[PDB]
Amino acid sequence: FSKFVRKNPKSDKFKVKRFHHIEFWCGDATNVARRFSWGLGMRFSAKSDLSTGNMVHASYLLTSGDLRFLFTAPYSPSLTTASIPSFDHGSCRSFFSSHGLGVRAVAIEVEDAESAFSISVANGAIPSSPPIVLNEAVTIAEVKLYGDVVLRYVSYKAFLPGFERVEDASPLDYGIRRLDHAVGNVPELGPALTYVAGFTGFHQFAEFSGLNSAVLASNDEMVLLPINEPVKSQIQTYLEHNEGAGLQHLALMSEDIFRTLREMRKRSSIGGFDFMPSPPPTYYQNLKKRVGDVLSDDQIKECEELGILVDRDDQGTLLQIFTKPLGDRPTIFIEIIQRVGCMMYQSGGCGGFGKGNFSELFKSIEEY
Amino acid sequence: FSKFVRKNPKSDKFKVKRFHHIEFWCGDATNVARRFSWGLGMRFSAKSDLSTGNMVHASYLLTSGDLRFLFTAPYSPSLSTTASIPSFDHGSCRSFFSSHGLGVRAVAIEVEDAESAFSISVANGAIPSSPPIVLNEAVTIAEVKLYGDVVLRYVSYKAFLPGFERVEDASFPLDYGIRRLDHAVGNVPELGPALTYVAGFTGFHQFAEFESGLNSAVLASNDEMVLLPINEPVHGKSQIQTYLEHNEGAGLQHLALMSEDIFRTLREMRKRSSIGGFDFMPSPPPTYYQNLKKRVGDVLSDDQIKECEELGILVDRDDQGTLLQIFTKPLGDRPTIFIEIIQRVGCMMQSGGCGGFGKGNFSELFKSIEEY
Ligand SMILES: Cc1ccccc1-n1c(=O)c2c(C)c(C(=O)C3=C(O)CCCC3=O)ccc2n(C)c1=O
Ligand SMILES: Cc1ccccc1-n1c(=O)c2c(C)c(C(=O)C3=C(O)CCCC3=O)ccc2n(C)c1=O
């Protein structure tokens, strides 16, 4: 008889709602956005460039359900008319030169961005962009998260001002619906948790080689922000190639992971994304004894064909798989997950974040 | 009652064979290469990156017949040489991409001897960019300046490049029919000094041609397989001056990719414009294709003209042959470099420059828009 007790102080210092968007910073946003669109199955739904009147930066929005990926690249400084107020030309090129293609801003929806900005800075956060109202409708603010990644606060009053809608009859959809969590890599986890939880009030989400991890969650546990430190270690290899702290991977949730994985693997060799090598077959015959009450044998058979990892915790089950690095550097990659269980409308973090797969993947290799 | 005479001095100062490859300079070569591979139907052939030992730059080679597109992005200098291409520089790559954006860096041509072609080039006025460097005692590379920040690269073998590994076929890989790069066109503020410079050290002759806002001129090798047109803006709006502003100076404007079948390729490319490929310029009016049976009805049937109207192909004709062509939208953020898809018909003995370069389609499109 085992029981796992979880505690949630709900110590959020301001009102946080949901993940808003993710802003990649590119050198040329057109080719990065068009490739992520075909590989992930995300629709071209908004733009802010020369064709809209923007002479400062080219920004393209891909949407799949609620998930929103923004791809921003700077124009020539000799051409303000920008839509993103915090965008500085020198920062973007310096960001790309030292880190490569990576995530710049992790945006979350708050009831009020300036209040969220004032409480954060008063609780240790280093500011990055002041609260700025746009067309008397949207307010944006940015604070330092880690390295050159910023935590962005978005608030409404009822995509963004300056963006034009894009409607086409393409329409790409592989099943992915929202962003589940965003993980970062830092040298020292202690000072990072002290910092981030210090100004957000996020509580630590309990759990259950080469890394130490901890998950900061919001009151509703829908905004999840894990952080990794190295202890060979893939975390250290990230810090070497990214040159300091940075976002490690974006965990993307889909309403069907089998539908998504089928679409993404078909396109791996024709512009999409490739995946890590699959587990040995002993991993998948040892599944009916581990998760035989949640997945049928056909569904176990579907994971074996698509290289899907399955792990279990105190209350749910997590199907997951990882892609290869998205760009040149062995840095940012994508995680595709589907959470099963915890229906009360579903609890955030249902099934965990796949820590148990480290022991289970190892265990299955000695048998094979 | 009419005839067009063409003179060929054959004044190449060194033996020029054929186009070798085109090197794009990117910020991230992985997302650009997988983009071009899907949109153009080119196969992953060779790589030179971290998985290969290279910690200075990442370079991926896409091939389609004999066409070769190289995409190079700089790694961080903190990973320190192991670079496969000796003329690479992290400072120049970041500076080139910051100044002009995604564009062509090197136009590589195959020659008899790169040590010979470099010495004669500089001796006849060319500005050097990379001395001839024998690599693995098997191939020689040298670079002289061409346009603004575009270099003319000489590739000569002794019997892709050493340092690369052949990428085994991942699948029946992608092939849309594109077989070869026809010509590479650049934009320049003054056609005068550009012609005297380039033709001054190459020895290339002026390939004569048989309103818009440009004055053009085509340089060609003796066999007329390496075609390098140069464009200048005509003022008094011009898409070249627009190019010069956003490109932050001179640079390569477009590349013509010859296809063994232009209808195949256009169907495949247009199939993918909405799903990550390349978009195309708006199609001509329906009166443009109703005017085709009299212009070009002796070489194209009523169905191939019907296939041009559906795919949006431009048809032009000169004294020697015919030309089918179509143009994509700019490949990157800035409206700078785009891609041309052509197929030349006739001039069989196929001659270089068969059908011309579509310069008769400026007035032909205008003559078909002016239809009530
Ligand atoms: C895929 C891979 C390649 C080369 C080195 C390692 C891996 N690798 C992972 O990176 C991996 C991750 C990143 C998670 C994961 O998502 C997760 C973390 O463990 C950090 C805490 C929060 C979180 O969400 C889970 C399982 C993983 N597993 C099982 C795996 O093997
Ligand atoms: C002008 C323009 C504006 C917006 C989109 C498309 C166009 N556009 C072209 O760019 C265009 C080109 C580029 C050629 C062409 O290939 C060419 C030259 O114009 C110069 C001589 C060497 C050469 O190769 C031929 C016809 C063209 N036509 C008919 C056209 O409409």
Ligand SMILES: [Co+2]
């Ligand atoms: Co994760």
Ligand SMILES: [Co+2]
């Ligand atoms: Co052309």
